[PDB]
Structure formats: structure tokens, C-alpha cells
């Protein structure tokens, strides 16, 4: 039902350099899909 | 934390056959792009294959291509290597390692030299006994 | 109708530190590309250093990473190479070109030879006095 | 089925050199792998050299070192066997044996005596004042 608007523009100039940017962490691992507008920031061991 | 340790190698003979494993004890594979890098003796470490993060996507170089054979498997989490037709000069110590996401091969980026973030110990691969 | 003058250069020492400027008489930057080339004594002309249209894209040749900066201001309509930690084989006429459009890295291409359309007339720098 | 037809031989003295030449009519020659073995009067027959199915890999005796050179052309699919220096003790019949496979050194396993499923018939070489 979103009312918004969406702005994106490309950053390879300050976000990345030859070693590699490691500061941005995506997370793969969660136990049940998130509720809309909802984040989850604790660290805890995901076995398979 | 992430620890990419290497099983096999050891004594074999030209013409024969020998199995490498590398099983990560971080963090797991069909995520992270691995490959595999040798190191001849008195020589620069050059790789020599690798397997994408998605699907079964393989690379191989223009000296060893046919030979040998890459291949993984998800649940034992470990990457396997099977060598095939073992000639005289590919006494190397043998290296496995691993990055985020589809790095060989990626748009006009191959894996060129040594651009992974992770490195392993290594094993010593000796012919010709 | 479109000029480019070449400002800087001097006598000074090995290891020392310069600035050099790149102005545009007709069009304007920061909608054309543009980039830097050298000229040695009895060496054919080659490349330094390019930049695109937009943003802050930024590129070097192979034996010239770590040792030059680039930056350009559309306030002052003009270009600053600087120049850091120089060496004796660093002496040639430094030429400044611009081109419409980001051709720096443009796809499957860089910016090889000297493609590029407007010209400027340059400076002579030299080293080791 | 398959016959194996050796030729050469004759009168040698020490210090000459002779080529014996092996033609299988049936089997194909670089996929399968032949040698040679001798037999002395009095003795118990013992191997000369060897080549793989895999391209010219050679094997050798410890007798035979430096003296005894083995080729294989598969144009008119006949292997040579080529020797120099004979001394006063190499007097012996020759047979040429093919096994399919990469028979020889494969593991655990030399071309020790005669387990080869292709035979032929022998030459004489002797040699004397």
C-alpha cells in the first residue's frame, strides 16, 4: 500500500576500493520473513 | 574466524590420480565464490580453478583444462577436486580460498592474481617418486 | 574554437611535489570527459590518467597507481592533476584532452592510445636538476 | 586373433647399433600399451622397456639406462626399439607385448614378467667377434 517514492544512484566511488568494502553486511539467515517496516540486529548462530 | 583448511596430497606417480578436499569451517559454500591456487616451487602462485556462488558455473586455466575437475557439495560444506593424468612439473603446494559472491569471471573481471579474501594453510602435492 | 591550456611545470628535485592545471576555453567540464597524456623524449605518446563525464570516476596506467591524484572544480573551470613522489624517468610534455561523453572505461573499452578529439598545446616538465 | 610380427636382428658387434621394429596388424597403437622383454639361454625371461597408452611416456630397466631408447609412430602404427652400445652379454631373443591400458606403473603394479594378453613370435640378436 506504499505511498513514496523510490531514489537510487549508482556509488562505486566512495562504497568500494581495491580490497574490498566490508563495511556493508547483508544478512541471509533469519528464522521467519520480517513484518513491513520491522529490522532485526541481534547476532545469533543460525545452524541448518 | 573463517578457517579454510585443505585434506590430501602426499606421494604420487605420473599417470596416477589424487583427491582434494578444502572444508570450510566459517562460513558456508553455495554463497562465497572459492577456487583453488598452486604455488611451484622458486614460482609465483597462479590459480587454477574456481566454481561461482550460484549454480555449478566452472572455469579452469589453458594448461590444465580437461584434466583436472572441480566439483562441491553443499551438505558435507566442502569443495572437492579430482586430479586426473598427474604430469611432472605440477608439484605445488595447493591452496584453497574464497569471496563474497560471483568474483571469477564477473562482467570484464576474471580471477586474476591473488584478489580473494580468504586464504587457507595448504597441502604439498609431490610426483614422479 | 575549443583550447586547452597546459599551466605548471618546472625545475625541481626527485621526490618532490607539483601542480599542474587544465583549462577549457570553449566547452565547459563535468559534462565531457576528459584526461591526461605525456609525451617522453623519443617515446611515442601514451596516457596518464581519465576521468568521465559525470561524477568522480577515476583511473590510472599501470606504473603510475598511488603516485597521482585527480580532481576537477566547475567553479574555477579547470582540471588539477597533482603530482606526488616523482622519479627521473617521470620527464615529458604533459597534454591535456577532453572528449564528449564517458569514455573512460566505457564498456569493453578503455581509454587506449590517443582516440581523443580536442587537443592542447602542453608543458614540458623536467626532474633532476 | 591379433598378430604381433617382429623384424630386425642379425649380426651385431659390440660398439654397433641395431633398430628392431614391432607391427600389430589388428590393435591400434597410443591406446594401447606395448614393451618389450628378452630371454636369454639359461635364464628367466625379464622386461626392457616399456611405453603407456597416454602419449610417450617411457619406462626403463635398470640394466637398460641411457642405452636402450623406445618410440612409438602410429602412422604406420609400429614401434622402434633402438640400440646402442651393445656389449657381449645383451645376446638374447626379444618379444614385443601389447596389454590395453595404461598397463605399466599404474600404482602399485610394475610390468613385471609376462601377464600381457598380445604376444608374437621373437628375433634373435646376437652378438660376438
Not at chain 1, 568500494?16 to 517496516?37: A, C, I, V
Not at chain 2, 584434466?67 to 603446494?93: C, G, H, P, W
Request: proline share 2%.
Amino acid at each position: 500500500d506504499f505511498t513514496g517514492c523510490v531514489i537510487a544512484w549508482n556509488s562505486n566511488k566512495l562504497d568500494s576500493k581495491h580490497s574490498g568494502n566490508y563495511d556493508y553486511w547483508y544478512r541471509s539467515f533469519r528464522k521467519s520473513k520480517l513484518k513491513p517496516f520491522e529490522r532485526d540486529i541481534s547476532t545469533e548462530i543460525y545452524q541448518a | 574466524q573463517v578457517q579454510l583448511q585443505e585434506s590430501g596430497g602426499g606421494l604420487v606417480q605420473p599417470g596416477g590420480s589424487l583427491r582434494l578436499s578444502c572444508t570450510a569451517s566459517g562460513i558456508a559454500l553455495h554463497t562465497h565464490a572459492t577456487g583453488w591456487f598452486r604455488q611451484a616451487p622458486g614460482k609465483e602462485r597462479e590459480g587454477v580453478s574456481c566454481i561461482s556462488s550460484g549454480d555449478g558455473t566452472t572455469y579452469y586455466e589453458d594448461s590444465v583444462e580437461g584434466r583436472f575437475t572441480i566439483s562441491r557439495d553443499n551438505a558435507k560444506n566442502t569443495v572437492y577436486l579430482q586430479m586426473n593424468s598427474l604430469k611432472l612439473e605440477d608439484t605445488a603446494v595447493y591452496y584453497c580460498a574464497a569471496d563474497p559472491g560471483a568474483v571469477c569471471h564477473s562482467g570484464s573481471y576474471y580471477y586474476t592474481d591473488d584478489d580473494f579474501y580468504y586464504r587457507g594453510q595448504g597441502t604439498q602435492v609431490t610426483v614422479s617418486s
